[PDB]
């Protein structure tokens, strides 16, 4: 699949808003993920024990990891499809070290869309949401392909 320049502009326009507060958005997204799909929390030996949203919000480690993840995702999106190099180390650690099924990548995609829709309604209309979904689907398709080459494909 290929996104048009118009679609990348919609994606990068809302992402610029997200970058005004990377830590806050990372927190909102991770918490949304963990509450909506509790099973995903089990994959993190570092956060596995967090029982409530209040505990999650209070976690300095969780906030730090949210920044790390959003920064990695941001670097990928800014490549506008030419992200092959960035995808390699990412696919290897998630397939081989962390063992994350593709199923989970869809869950986080949903969380990202949910959060952007809540915080940026004016820059996240139907067209902008379609563009973001297309960018995330592209990301998932490429990660899935790498998973297979690596001998995993979760
Ligand atoms: C947009 C999606 C994703 C991105 C960009 C991303 C990115 C990252 C990055 C950059 C790290 C740091 C170093 C490394 O590669 O290990 C990491 C670690 C990790 N990721 Fe992801 N990830 C994504 C999705 C997921 C999902 C959906 C899960 C689990 C449900 C997951 C679980 C983990 C775990 C268990 C670690 C290590 C945590 C630790 O002990 O420090 N990742 N991820």
From Swiss-Prot:
Domain Globin: 2-148
Enzyme Commission number(s) from the entry: 1.7.-.-, 1.11.1.-
GO molecular function: heme binding; metal ion binding; nitrite reductase activity; oxygen binding; oxygen carrier activity; peroxidase activity
Residues bearing PTM Phosphothreonine: 68
Catalytic activity: Fe(III)-heme b-[protein] + nitric oxide + H2O = Fe(II)-heme b-[protein] + nitrite + 2 H(+); H2O2 + AH2 = A + 2 H2O
Residues the record lists as Phosphoserine modifications: 4
Compartmental location: Cytoplasm, Sarcoplasm
GO cellular component, one term: sarcoplasm
Residues forming coiled coils: none
Disulfide bond listed as a keyword: no
Protein name according to UniProt: Myoglobin
Taxonomic source organism: Physeter macrocephalus
Originating gene: MB
